[PDB]
Ligand binder design. Structure first.
Ligand SMILES: [Zn+2]
Ligand SMILES: [Zn+2]
Ligand SMILES: [Zn+2]
Lengths: 135, 82, 158
């Protein structure tokens, strides 16, 4: 009965001072990815919005961020492009912290753009990776 | 707001040109090319100055036999790095 | 046009890469602390808007800063390098941390991390209960707040 909203609110409102038992129900949550169509897209947008948030410490957000990035190519490309763009825009405020993440995301997005015979978009996406002006 | 906050941060950073050298000003070819002279008729390398301008070694050799100044900044040329 | 609150009193020394002997010779992968990321982003934007065609390489081993303790008995303010500040910031989760947590948070190299740990032990900021601080898997460091400072500056520089 819409308990997902209550769980999400409790999780972000949680202090999480322990952090030692988070692994169990984060691995449980990891396999809970397939939510059919638009529900999956909304859930992934909410997840990345909650993990982009400033209050989350930069010790576990990066690891699950790369794990979600590697889980992303399993999705169909049509929605994969949209979620890649959305997470690129959401990580845009904090790029210097997430450099591996943006690099991998842009590489995957450029690949899927190239497989669509769209060279301009793929080249522009690959350009956005900071290779000299990067930390 | 936190338990152990940060007040001040004295940062130190180094700035550098995004593209230092990409073409010899004399031959107009790329600095990794054959200086246009070795290209038409043949080791080609870079020769920097005290201004760090990085022309082709052969191109700056040909330029120096007529003019004593750097092509770009028009100052007295002194060799540095090779 | 939009209000910018860095949360940090920011002062920087931007130096020529070619002129200065300093360089990013070490392969340190030091992860930036999250509190002062806004400062570096704002200054990178300012430098891009001001000087075109340049890039910035922050020397994370030469920048220092002040961390203030005010609710732990008001023990004045400490001044430490960013390497010595990332570990203190990671100590915010709890009084005792492991080497794995520091490795995952600061993302520093083994040599730099061990140097920071040794310098902290010289300060006696953190300590080990036993003599197991050697190369192992536990590395159970802990706080030593009972050994409060005597001066206020506590300006370590060597
Ligand atoms: Zn030339
Ligand atoms: Zn030549
Ligand atoms: Zn010159």
């Amino acid at each position: 009965a819409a308990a997902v909203r209550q769980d999400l609110a409790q999780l972000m409102n949680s202090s999480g001072s322990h952090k030692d038992l988070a692994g169990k129900y984060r691995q449980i949550l990891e396999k809970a990815i397939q939510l059919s169509g638009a529900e999956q897209l909304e859930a992934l947008k909410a997840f990345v919005e909650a993990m982009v948030n400033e209050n989350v410490s930069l010790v576990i957000s990066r690891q699950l961020l790369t794990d979600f990035c590697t889980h992303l190519p399993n999705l169909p490309d049509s929605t994969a492009k949209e979620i890649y763009h959305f997470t690129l825009e959401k990580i845009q405020p904090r790029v210097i912290s997430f450099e591996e993440q943006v690099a991998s995301i842009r590489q995957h997005l450029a690949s899927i753009y190239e497989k669509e015979e769209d060279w301009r978009n793929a080249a522009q996406v690959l350009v956005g990776i900071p290779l000299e002006t990067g930390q | 707001k936190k338990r152990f906050e940060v007040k001040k941060w004295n940062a130190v950073a180094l700035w550098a040109w995004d593209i230092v050298v990409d073409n010899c000003a004399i031959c107009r070819n790329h600095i990794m090319d054959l200086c246009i002279e070795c290209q038409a008729n043949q080791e080609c390398t870079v020769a920097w100055g005290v201004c760090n301008h990085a022309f082709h070694f052969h191109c700056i050799s040909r330029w120096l036999k007529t003019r004593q100044v750097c092509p770009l900044d028009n100052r007295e040329w002194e060799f540095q790095k090779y | 046009d939009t209000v910018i609150d860095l949360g940090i009193s920011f002062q920087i020394y931007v130096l020529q890469a070619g002129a200065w002997p300093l360089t990013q010779a070490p392969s340190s992968t030091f992860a930036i602390p999250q509190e002062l990321e806004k400062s570096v982003q704002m200054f990178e934007l300012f430098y891009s808007q001001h000087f075109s065609g340049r890039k910035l390489t922050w020397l994370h081993y030469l920048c220092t800063g002040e961390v203030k303790m005010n609710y732990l008995g008001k023990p004045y303010v400490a001044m430490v390098t960013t390497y010595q500040m990332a570990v203190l910031l990671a100590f915010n989760n709890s009084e005792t941390v492991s080497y794995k947590e520091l490795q995952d948070s600061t993302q520093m190299n083994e040599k730099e991390l061990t140097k920071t740990i040794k310098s902290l032990l010289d300060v006696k900021m953190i300590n080990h209960d036993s003599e197991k601080e050697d190369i192992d898997a536990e590395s159970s460091f802990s706080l030593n707040m009972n050994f409060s400072s005597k001066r206020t500056k506590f300006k370590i520089t060597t």
